[PDB]
Structures are given as C-alpha cells and as structure tokens.
Design a protein around this nucleic acid. Structure first.
Lengths: 58, 174, 213, 146, 37
RNA sequence: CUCGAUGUCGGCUCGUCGCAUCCUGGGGCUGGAGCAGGUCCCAAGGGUUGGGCUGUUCGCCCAUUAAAGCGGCACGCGAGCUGGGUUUAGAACGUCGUGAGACAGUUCGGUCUCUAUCCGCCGCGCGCGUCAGAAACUUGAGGAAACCUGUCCCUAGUACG
RNA sequence: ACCGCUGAAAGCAUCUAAGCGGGAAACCUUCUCCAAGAUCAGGUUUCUCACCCACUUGGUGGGAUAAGGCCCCCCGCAGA
C-alpha cells in the first residue's frame, strides 16, 4: 500500500489489475520488489493501470 | 415577499461593495457591514441595491430577506436618524446631565450612570422624559437593554420606563 | 508596585498606641543592608529583582557567588531572594546598587509577610490536621489519638489521594496577609509590624506591600 | 523477508504542514501515518521509524462553535473530584498546541514506541517557526485514486 | 415559568416557537410562558 | 458467586459523592399591595449544630439557628473503636407442650484476636539521568488547601399600604 | 435559568437560524501553597574549563586533579 500510494494507486485496484493481467505473484515477493527494485514496482503499477477497464460500473 | 423589495438609496455618497462588505457614508456618521457570503449582492441599473441568491436552500431565503432589511436599515440610519423616546411614570425622579450622561435614581441611592457606547446621541426633554437617537438600532437598543431590569417596573402602580404605551399591565386592586 | 524588603524576625513585644490600645508587635529588622540585582523581562519574561541581605565573611562565600556579586559590583551577602514586582515593564524603577530601606513603608500601611515557618516535626493528625479525638474511657482499647476509618471497603478498594494522614509539618513558605505596620523605626532600620510573623527568632522574613487593603 | 530493519537505516526527513484551513481530524491522521512511516515502503512497526512532522499555524484550525462550546476536555488528577473540566475553546485560546497534540496522541498507538514517536513531534501554534536550519519539506494533504 | 412536558395554547392570542430546540409559548400576557421541558 | 469462615444493628471517629437544595446565591409566575409567603427553574462552592428519654434505626419534645437536607459508598468504615439490643451456654415470668423443651415476646449477666509482605496513601532520603562537571535565584504548564454567615446602623419609619 | 437588542424563515409576529449584549456563592483568571523526574526533564547568571597510563590511535578501561561537595567533628527553638 505504501509503495502503491507513492505511485498514486491503491492496493485494491493494484491487486484487481494484476489479477486481470494474470500476474499470479504473491505478496511476499511483490513487497520484496517494492524495496529491491522500486522501478519494477512502478512497471507493475503501469501494467495494472492499463489492465483495469474504465470505471466502477458493471 | 421580502425579496421583492428594492432598496432606495437617496444619498449614495459612498454606498459600495468592497469584498463582501458594504461601506456606507452619508449625512450622519459612517457605517459598515460584513455581507453574508452565501448571498450575491449587486448594484442595480437605477442605483438601488439588489440582494439575491437564486438556489434553493431556504436559509438562502432567510439570509436574503435578512440582509435586505439590514442594508435598508443602514440606508435609513445614515439618511434619517433613529429615535427612541423614554418617559418615566413614577415619583421621586429628576434627570441631571452631569459630565456627559444621564443620571437616574427613582428613589434610591447611588444614581446609575449608563455607560454610553461609542457613537450615540442623548437628549432630555423633561425631568421625567428623555430620548435617545443614533445611527444604529442595536446601539440605541443597547441603552434600552441597559436601562431594563434596573428596578423592575411593577405592573401595579408602575415605577420605570415606558415607550409611550406598550399596554403595560395593571394592578388587581390590593 | 509590590515594593518590599528582606529582614529577620527578632521576636515579639507589645506597645501602646495613641488611643490607649495594645499593639502586639513583631520586630522585623530590615534596615540599610539590602542590595539589588535586576532581572528584566526582556531576557526571560520573569520581571523581578534579586534582593540580598545579611553578613558573611569574605572567605566563606564560594567562587560562583563571589563571581556573580563581584560581576554585579556588590559586596557579597549571605541570603539572596527575588521579589516579583509587576506584570508591566517597570524598567525605570530599580537598578543595580539602589539601596532599599524600611522607610519605603508608610507607618501604617498593610503588608504581606512570608517566610519559612517554625518546625514542629512529625505529628499525628491531631496536630497535623486537627481531628476530633476519639473517646478514651468506655472501652477505648488502643485508639486514643488515632484517625480511625478511611473511605469505604469493597468498591472503593483504595484510599483516595489527598487524605489527611500523619506526616511532617513546618519549614513551609507561610504567608500572613494584611498585617498592619505599626511603625517604621527609620532611625535604626527596625520595622515594627502588628501581629505575629512566621519563623523563629533569628529566622528569615520577607516583607512586601499588600495588594488587597 | 524484511530488509528495512537495521540500525541507522533510517532517513529522518522534516515535513511542514500549514494547518490553517485543514480540519483537525484529517490533519491528525496524515500527521500520524506520515510520522510513523506508513507512507514509506520500508515500514517496520517494531522500530521507531518515520519522519519528523511540524505543525504550522495550529491556531487557525477550523473547528465549529458547536464543538468549541460543547466538546469538553477532561483531565482528572487523582484526588477526589479534581476532574479538570475545561472547554476546547478556552484551550484554543490558551494552548492549542496541546489540543492538536492530544488529538494526534489519541490516534497513535498506546505503547513504548508511541512515546518515542511523541518526542519526535514539534507543534507550534504560530506561523513563524525558527527551525529553519534543517530541511523542511512543505507537505499537503491529498487523496490518491478511487 | 410553567416548565412541563406538554404545551398547548392558553387562548387564541399566542404562538408556539422553537427556541434553541426548546418549544415555548408566547401569548402577550405573562400568565404562564409555558415551556416544553 | 462466597459454608476448608465476606464477622451482623445502632453509636463514635474520618472522608467522599449525587442533587430529587434546609439555608446562603441568581430568576420566572402568582388570588405577589409592602414585609412575608406558595409554586416552578438554575446552581454542589461552603455550612447543615448542641441537648432529654428509648439499645436504636424511626420518631416526640424544649431551647437556639440563615438552616436545623434526603440518600449511595459491604443498610460506608469492627486486620480503626464500642458490644447496649440482636444470636451461644446460666436464671426467671407468661403461653404452648403430660414431658424433654419451644416462642422473630419480654427480663438480668455474658472476652470482640493478628509483630503490615503487596496495592494505595502519608512524609522524608539514597542512586541515576536531565549529554562536560557544579553552585544560586526562578518562570509555573499542570494540581492542591481555602470558598460560610448573622446582628445593628445609614438610606428610612422612606417607598408601599 | 431569566430578561434583551437588530431582524428573516412566513409582507406580520418572534431573544435566532447569521449576528450583538446583560446575566449567579458554580467554572476560569485573580489571592495563598507544592512543583522541571513537567523524561518536552526548562530558562538566566557565574566558576572550574588539555592531566597521566594500559588496550587497538579511534572504540573503551584505570588512576589522579580544579570549581565544589561529601565523610568525620562542635551545635540547633531543624530533626525518627
């Protein structure tokens, strides 16, 4: 959540996006990435943002 | 219906809006007034003041009518002094004007001297009749509130200020 | 405003006034032996003046104190106490070197006197607080002069803080208000105050002008 | 596992919040998380992490008169009675820094680190803050997304 | 004044007002000045 | 809940607390003329006494008082006190019981244990820190103690009647 | 609590929703006292303000000294 907020995105939509992308990556190693390579975290954030549809309606 | 009442400005010497604040100058001492921010107030083509708020909030209607009467009262005050007259119906009383105020004592010690507010006019019409005037009904009413509760006028015989009537109560015999 | 001076209690006596009435007098010695060191509010907001009074030997007072007093330019003294003046600016009032005597009192002015009270020692509540003592005939086994019960039993399972219990008293900053100065003996520096003053003969007395009057 | 816990592995930055129009609660929350370090990915609740937080112009915090005249503050001493009841309005007119401090402390946890964090708090009612030798960073409140 | 948990009119020369949340009656005749609690 | 034990009434002593306030204080209304007085609202900051008789609570009474308040806190407090009554064993009158004996009916007498470890409290110290080591004077955030009241005179025998 | 000024909602009225003022032994300043162990441990002033070894120069120990204080001693109307 902290790193996500640094990339201006919430945990909710982060996980939703990663699921839509099929990125079955656990929270342990994702949190690891948040420290070892923040840029990779940013990349994953961009992937989630692109994968998210449009809004909160269905 | 109060929202339909325009505000005549016979003088208009410095009647103007400066940032939700109405400056008023005229024949008498100058006046000011903070404008309620929710209400839009603007000058008319004919010089009258237009007070309005179009949206539906009811409190906007209360503030619309209220601020309309506040501005009307400002213009009335600066163009025509406000006057309230007070007369004593009692025994044992003589008004003296020592220094710069009215000394009253309806048959008791330590005559009371009313601390006057800044900007107020006083006058004495008789030993049992006097008047107060000014440019603010709240400042003039402050003297009416200060003189109140000073020896509460009993409804029986009477022992205090009346405003030329007011249907003051009466005794029930004895 | 709260003018004042340090002195010491030299016991009590009595003297008859002009109306043939008895005045109990405490002798407070406060003559030309009081010196100053100002404390302006500009540096700490205290707004007060240090008063020094007494007599010492030049080989008795330690170096920090001889440093302060010789920096001030004042001959050292035994006691030092600071008198609060007023919450204003004062400034043009007291200075370093201004001598203050008992003549500052107006032979009748009311004053407030404060100082260390006489020691009485560790005592029970009968003296410490003044309890109504328990009976000592009808079966009173071993309760003469004892406090007895305190509070409740089950629910308030504690003694309330601030109860009146046995303890020491004395050596306190006791202040007596509105004492009438009978007479300033300006020819000797002896301040004759109506009434009793806290402290033993030889003790330190702080005298200042009263504010109630 | 974790990488952040380690002696000396902490960036003690300084943050400044111009608490003028902001509401007390939202200010206190942001100060609490910002102070503890949850805005950082190197969170480690076991240690005194986080950055320094400065509150500026606390006197001007908007609080309705409906609470200035009703939200009472209670400081019981321990003695009988001794319930030091005092209005928050009067506290705003005497020591508003203690009001803000109280609000933050009520949002912080109640443990030993809470006190070590408290001593990292500096609150001054006025706008003019002498502490300019360090590196203050103006920080404003925001929402993120969603 | 006649403080009680019930308000009605003494006569048809009065008004019921809500002052600071407390209902009270004014009737230009200081006989009761009744107040809803 | 407590029978391998919470020791009961009343009274003394010591406090605390509520306000459904006895007085003091601030007001409204009145069939309040004034003094007084009825009722109602606000208010716990103090005070709320001293005696006779009964073991008392509860009551009665005299005399004072601005006033002689209602209750909680193991029907406050017995590891602080009393042991008069209640509830031990003795004895007697009455009633019941053939009787032994009983009566929340009465009458006499009948021990009230503990060297204070902890919590809390009350007082005073030792140590360490308060970023070099020390000595003086002090701000006082924050808390405590105290917070009562009458008589008389003047206004004035005035206003009112 | 009560009384009240100005004045809407609702052409009036109204102590009121903006707004102003009066208003009690209660409250808080004010008067007295403890108090910086108030660990946010305060502030002002003043004095002393390189001295020698061991270990690994630092990191740390040991010994001594200035200001000053303590111990011991003579006393207190200060005190277990």
């Amino acid at each position: 959540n902290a790193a996500a907020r640094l990339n201006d995105i919430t945990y909710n939509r982060l996980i939703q996006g990663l699921k839509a992308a099929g990125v079955e990556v656990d929270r342990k190693n994702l949190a690891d990435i948040a420290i070892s390579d923040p840029a990779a975290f940013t990349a994953l954030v961009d992937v989630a943002r692109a994968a998210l549809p449009e809004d909160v309606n269905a | 219906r109060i929202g339909k009442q325009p505000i005549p400005v016979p003088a208009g010497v410095d009647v103007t809006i400066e940032g939700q604040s109405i400056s008023v100058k005229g024949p008498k001492g100058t006046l000011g007034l903070t404008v309620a921010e929710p209400i839009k107030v603007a000058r008319n083509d004919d010089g009258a003041i237009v007070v309005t708020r179009p949206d539906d909030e009811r409190r906007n209607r209360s503030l619309h009518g209220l601020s309309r009467t506040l501005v009307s009262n400002l213009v009335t005050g600066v163009t025509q002094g406000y006057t309230t007259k007070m007369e004593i119906f009692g025994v044992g009383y003589r008004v003296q004007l020592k220094g710069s105020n009215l000394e009253f004592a309806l048959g008791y010690s330590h005559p009371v001297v009313i601390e006057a507010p800044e900007g107020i006019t006083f006058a004495v019409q008789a030993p049992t009749k006097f008047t107060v005037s000014g440019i603010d009904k709240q400042k003039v009413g402050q003297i009416a509130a200060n003189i109140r509760r000073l020896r509460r006028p009993d409804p029986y015989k009477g022992k205090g200020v009346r405003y030329e009537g007011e249907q003051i109560r009466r005794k029930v015999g004895k | 405003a709260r003018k004042g001076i340090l002195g010491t209690k030299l016991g009590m006596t009595q003297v008859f006034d002009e109306s043939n009435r008895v005045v109990p007098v405490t002798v407070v010695k406060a003559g030309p032996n009081v010196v100053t060191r100002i404390r302006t509010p500009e540096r700490d907001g205290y707004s007060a003046v240090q008063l020094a009074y007494g007599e010492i030997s030049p080989r008795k007072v330690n170096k920090p104190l001889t440093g302060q007093y010789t920096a001030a330019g004042v001959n050292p003294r035994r006691y030092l106490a600071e008198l609060r003046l007023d919450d204003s600016d004062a400034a043009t009032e007291y200075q370093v070197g201004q001598e203050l005597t008992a003549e500052i009192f107006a032979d009748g002015s009311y004053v407030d006197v404060t100082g260390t009270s006489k020691g009485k020692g560790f005592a029970g509540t009968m003296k410490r607080h003044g309890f109504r003592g328990q009976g000592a005939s009808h079966g009173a086994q071993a309760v003469h002069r004892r406090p007895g019960s305190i509070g409740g039993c089950a629910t308030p399972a504690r003694v309330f803080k601030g109860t009146r219990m046995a303890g020491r008293m004395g050596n306190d900053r006791v202040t007596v208000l509105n004492l009438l100065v009978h007479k300033v003996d300006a020819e000797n520096g002896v301040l004759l105050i109506k009434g009793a003053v806290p402290g033993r003969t030889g003790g330190l007395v702080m005298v200042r002008s009263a504010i109630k009057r | 596992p974790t990488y952040a816990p380690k002696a000396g592995d902490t960036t003690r930055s300084w943050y400044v919040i111009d608490a003028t129009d902001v509401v007390l609660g939202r200010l206190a929350v942001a100060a609490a998380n910002l102070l503890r370090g949850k805005h950082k990915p190197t969170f480690a609740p076991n240690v005194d992490g986080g950055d320094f937080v400065i509150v500026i112009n606390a006197d001007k915090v908007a609080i309705s008169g409906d609470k200035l005249q009703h939200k009472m503050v209670y400081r019981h001493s321990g003695y009988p009675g001794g319930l030091h009841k005092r209005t928050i309005g009067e506290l705003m007119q005497r020591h508003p820094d203690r009001v803000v401090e109280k609000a933050i402390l009520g949002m912080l946890p109640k443990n030993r680190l809470s006190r070590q964090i408290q001593r990292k708090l500096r609150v001054y009612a006025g706008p003019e803050h002498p502490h300019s030798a360090q590196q203050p960073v103006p920080y404003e409140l925001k929402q993120v997304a969603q | 004044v006649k403080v009680n948990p019930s308000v009605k009119p003494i006569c048809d020369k009065c008004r019921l007002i809500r002052r600071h949340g407390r209902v009270m009656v004014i009737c230009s005749d200081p006989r009761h000045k009744q107040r809803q609690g």
